[PDB]
Design a protein around this ligand. Structure first.
Ligand SMILES: Nc1ncnc2c1ncn2[C@@H]1O[C@H](COP(=O)(O)OP(=O)(O)O)[C@@H](O)[C@H]1O
Ligand SMILES: Nc1ncnc2c1ncn2[C@@H]1O[C@H](COP(=O)(O)OP(=O)(O)O)[C@@H](O)[C@H]1O
Ligand SMILES: Nc1ncnc2c1ncn2[C@@H]1O[C@H](COP(=O)(O)OP(=O)(O)O)[C@@H](O)[C@H]1O
Ligand SMILES: Nc1ncnc2c1ncn2[C@@H]1O[C@H](COP(=O)(O)OP(=O)(O)O)[C@@H](O)[C@H]1O
Ligand SMILES: [Mg+2]
Ligand SMILES: [Mg+2]
Ligand SMILES: [Mg+2]
Ligand SMILES: [Mg+2]
Lengths: 371, 371, 371, 371
């Protein structure tokens, strides 16, 4: 049987087999095109690079992302990425391999339908399925009750689950994600004298964010300590040299999550969004939801995000009850792990969308089957 | 022999064996159905919960009561409750166990007939019986003369008995019960800012009534003290927190029993209903009926109901004689205790309705046997 | 001269002029009071409705009857009814109009005295009279000998008259009347599932009795036919719909007259009460009393009451003589007709109670004049 | 005298003089605050805009509503709105002008008391009054009997009135209103690709609802026609362009009124809520209530709401009687019209709450005067 699991995401692709411990193929979802003249002969060089190949040669080509905010915008580029992760990296023939895909909540309906057409016609898979990302995150932890805040690169969303029952009317979606955090870092870096405008230079700024930035417990008095002393500065070495220094911008970029007014959005922070979802549910189920808060998604991997979230939540909730933010140690590959577990149960082998059903019903079978 | 005793009631089920001191199984009579979508797999969750299981998971399912005002309205749900109290809780086989059932006065005749069909065919009991609830309340106290006011959750009724002879023409029945008291509390709680509309939130309001409400000796001057001082307020903590305060609504809900015009009914209070029953009997037996007033039924467990009833009764009766309201200390499990006593006498072993009689005569044997 | 005739009765008022054929004003004796809040303005609505007006608006107000069992209990309400039948309906000035009133046998003496005070002082009638109801029933039929059984809504009474001479020691009075028949119908209607408890819903039950109920010749074998076949059922449509079905309760309510043990009274039926009165008279006058039995009063208008009475009477009397129950075709307005005849004879114009006699003697002149 | 009439409502303010035909001032109840930096000088721009001014400049400021679900939550903002409708729009001095206010049923008591304090102290009105909104709706139609369903933007409520008498125990209140309908439209619009998250973009979605949405007679077969053909689609032009298309969402948003499970509420629809109120009244008054159903309130202005309500009501009521939903042509300004009529009668000039009474008694005089 050997079912396949694929996590498209936005900016990172995780692929592997069902029943394993970790994905066997991780690579960025980027397609590049040459930019310059192209002199000399006998080189035999390709016209487009996809995956980790584009990262190595990013100095002469332009990076482009097909998926954005969860929705796929370039369908011609996505067929190139799926071909790369099936024949070149996994080295498998999809003709005898059911696949599992993931999808964010509150997405256009046409997004699901087009994914089914490509897999069932271009690749000719025998079966396929589509599942919500945040539901699979609860399978990895071996739990049944709790509220999951899954923040990635495209979109962060919230959904409460109580004893295997979802509440579709208490689901909140917010655009703020890790991609908008990188752009804010680029803007506030110009006040020190550094300019980063090329699309190939957006990777330089992203790597700085992943290594230096951190979340401060308190914002008012942290800016006071950084204003006087210089003990909060670290150095980064660019690829060609010219080391740089980072001061109070180190803890200012992640703060946008709790104060989304730094870019201009009117929505509330992630600490108030998750409180409104809890108060939208029933009265007697809120007690179990407070003590089962789950964190998932790489943008929730900042040093100190678990203690800051706890401090703000207890300021709103009544003081009688106990609030504990359950942040596991491996939060980035939590969705994939849940997908592998789900695709191995004996009771799940009846909900596959077969080829016969698609031929008789058409692409509209997804909404009647998947969710 | 080991006869069985069951008290269906309305909202609470008492079951046990004959010859014991207390019922061994007490649980609400509630059947619940899931309401929400139901995501995830491998849970193996049931489609309906009955009894104490529904109370634990009441936050996602809907509560429904089959019995109402004494009459059973959902016969499909009642067979589910009887199955729960025979195999799951009592853990007994009804094939070799006679059972005893209770019934309120002035009920539709078809109610008795359908109960006999289910027990004698679905469960195949060897014998069965049906008795009036208020008659059994006199067995518990070891008395022979007196007037019994049995107020429960569905219906309150009155019946006088003098030296082992009943007076069927002096029996009064009034709908006002504990279920209508909870609904009135919900309506008058909105004037302070609290909203309780979900059927799962009716249990929250009921628990407040069972812990805080009390009966005031006088109504006119009690409202004057509560209007000026704030020494009559208590606090209640909701399951999620947000403690609340109760003022003069504390003693206003139980007052509806004595003044049924608060909801809109035209009938008189319980103090005047029991006086009319006494005056409907013979002249020379009224003296023994005045001094043998008996209270039974949980809704007669309010703090102060015994002194208030005495004050109103002596205002109508002549001042020569003595009026004493005999309110025992355990009034909730008084009917069950009387049923256990009755099902153990050697002289009662001849009035069982046998299987042979039912086959020859049919379901109409009850009216010719029971009452 | 134009004397006036008024028949107070109990539950129905008959008024008119002397010398006519039928009463010109018939309306119930009911006074109603508003029950609900009473929102809005500019309506100009009264605080009390009396007569046929209360029947139209009975859905928001409470019905109350002043006269009961023959005796008047609410003297303030009776002055309201008398004012309605003199100025509003008859449209006459009582200052120049002698009036005639009726009274049941064996009544408190204070009942007669208070009626004389009100008429002679509040209304200032020039003359008045009080007569026994059952004596006037013999004037309508143009007879001189016979025994009259007058059953109405308040009380049924018996009195034998032989050739213009009454026998005061052979007069029997029984409370059982049409008002107790309606209450019994309400109680036995609950065994089918219908509840009628509001005082405004007592009119619904009364109308069912006047249209469907009938008297059965034999009771033992009639219950056998109704137990097997369903050919004895009729349908009634309530004002809002929800039609109902009546089975063996159709002929059970009127049976209470012959078997007064259904409510709990110890007295004998109307067939045995009228036999005891005959045997209480002299031996040689019984022959003419047997063949001159007269029926009067609306509660004697049930279909089949004349044949049932004959069957029971001949079972007690000797078989030699002939028994014939003379039931006329218009038995409801028989008392009024007799009153009109009496108030027109030239020999009756000397027994009026004048204003001069009342002033000199006082209210005690009635007992010395009327009976 | 020239009494003043004000209808606060929730989201729309109607003001005018007593004795006219239409309100002279209609404007939204919205207070806005600047959001952005605010460069340049010499502009002289205000710090807060209230009324129609905020709608024009809504692109840079944030809209906020003080009144919500009937209860006022921001008392500082309400004093700003009342000042705007007295000096800026009506251009009147409230020192010599009695005012009339409206209030929804089943509201916190403190809501009425605080309104009296502000008017009698800050504005110094000589007299004032508070009336129920649904009672005034019957004055406009010139009727005395009927059941009124008043659905607005904050809360829909029901109350039956029979011949100028209200039934307080048959009053039902349901939160579902027009504000929850707009939020549902925003959520289901994301499935086509349109995002509307800014509070200033909630006005864009509301305008779409007021122009395109309609109620379908049947829901099951209407979704079948929209699934196959494309004849049920209309186009809307956004302020900057980018026209959009609406398909089956056109008739899905108003359907929430009849099926409140689309959001997650457990209560029944408006067709079943109004049927339960009728069955809660007396038996003989239901006939006049069925034929006098009155519609009022802008959310009852959807194309086809009158025919759909009739179809569902006759499915529950008995088939004998006639049901007619009396939906007038101008249902939005029905409450104001009734208030103008009431404040002009000569008999109403005695129920004003004077300044002298307030000084002697205090703010608690309202409950003893108004309702
Ligand atoms: N150690 C880290 N600290 C902070 N942010 C991180 C870290 N690792 C990854 N990220 C952020 O997480 C994002 C990747 O999220 P990912 O789990 O791939 O979501 P998706 O699968 O939906 O693309 C990147 O944009 C990156 O900015
Ligand atoms: N301590 C108490 N004080 C006041 N009311 C009570 C108390 N305990 C129970 N009740 C009321 O009594 C009702 C239960 O009555 P119950 O004895 O179960 O009658 P039945 O057996 O006919 O259901 C409940 O509705 C509850 O409101
Ligand atoms: N057609 C009928 N069949 C049976 N009973 C009737 C009929 N008409 C009237 N009655 C009964 O007769 C009573 C009216 O009696 P009525 O002649 O008014 O006596 P009174 O004048 O003393 O009130 C009512 O209570 C009603 O129940
Ligand atoms: N033509 C229309 N069709 C449908 N809904 C409407 C229409 N006009 C107004 N509404 C709705 O009615 C609401 C306004 O109700 P309103 O009469 O102002 O009540 P209130 O005075 O209590 O605010 C708005 O929220 C709007 O959604
Ligand atoms: Mg992710
Ligand atoms: Mg009980
Ligand atoms: Mg009569
Ligand atoms: Mg309105």
């Amino acid at each position: 049987t050997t079912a396949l699991v694929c996590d498209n995401g936005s900016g990172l692709v995780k692929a592997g087999f069902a029943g394993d411990d970790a994905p066997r193929a991780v690579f960025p979802s980027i397609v590049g095109r040459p930019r310059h003249q192209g002199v000399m002969v006998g080189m035999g060089q390709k016209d487009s690079y996809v995956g980790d190949e584009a990262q190595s040669k990013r100095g002469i080509l332009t990076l482009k992302y097909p998926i954005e905010h969860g929705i796929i915008t370039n369908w011609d580029d996505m067929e190139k990425i799926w071909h790369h992760t099936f024949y070149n990296e996994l080295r498998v023939a999809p003709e005898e391999h059911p696949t599992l895909l993931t999808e964010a909540p509150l997405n256009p309906k046409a997004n699901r339908e087009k994914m089914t057409q490509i897999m069932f016609e271009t690749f000719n898979v025998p079966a396929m399925y589509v599942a919500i990302q945040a539901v699979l995150s609860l399978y990895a932890s071996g739990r049944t009750t709790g509220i999951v805040l899954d923040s990635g690169d495209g979109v962060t969303h919230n959904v409460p689950i109580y004893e295997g029952y979802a509440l579709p009317h208490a689901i909140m979606r917010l655009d703020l994600a890790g991609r908008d955090l990188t752009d804010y870092l680029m803007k506030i870096l110009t006040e020190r004298g550094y300019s980063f405008v090329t699309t190939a230079e957006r990777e330089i700024v992203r790597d700085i964010k992943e290594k230096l930035c951190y979340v401060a417990l308190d914002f008012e008095n942290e800016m006071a300590t950084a204003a006087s002393s210089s003990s909060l500065e670290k150095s980064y070495e660019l690829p060609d040299g010219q080391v740089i220094t980072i001061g109070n911008e180190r803890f200012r970029c992640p703060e946008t999550l709790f104060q989304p007014s730094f870019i201009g959005m009117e929505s509330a922070g992630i600490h108030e969004t998750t409180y409104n979802s809890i108060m939208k549910c029933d009265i007697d189920i809120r007690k179990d939801l407070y003590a089962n808060n789950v964190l998932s998604g790489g943008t929730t991997l900042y040093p100190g995000i678990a203690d800051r979230m706890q401090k703000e939540i207890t300021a709103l909730a009544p003081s009688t009850m106990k609030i504990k933010i359950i942040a596991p140690p491996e939060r980035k590959y939590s969705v994939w792990i849940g997908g592998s577990i789900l695709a191995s149960l004996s009771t799940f082998q009846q909900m596959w969308i077969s080829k016969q059903e698609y031929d008789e019903a058409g692409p509209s079978i997804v909404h009647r089957k998947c969710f």
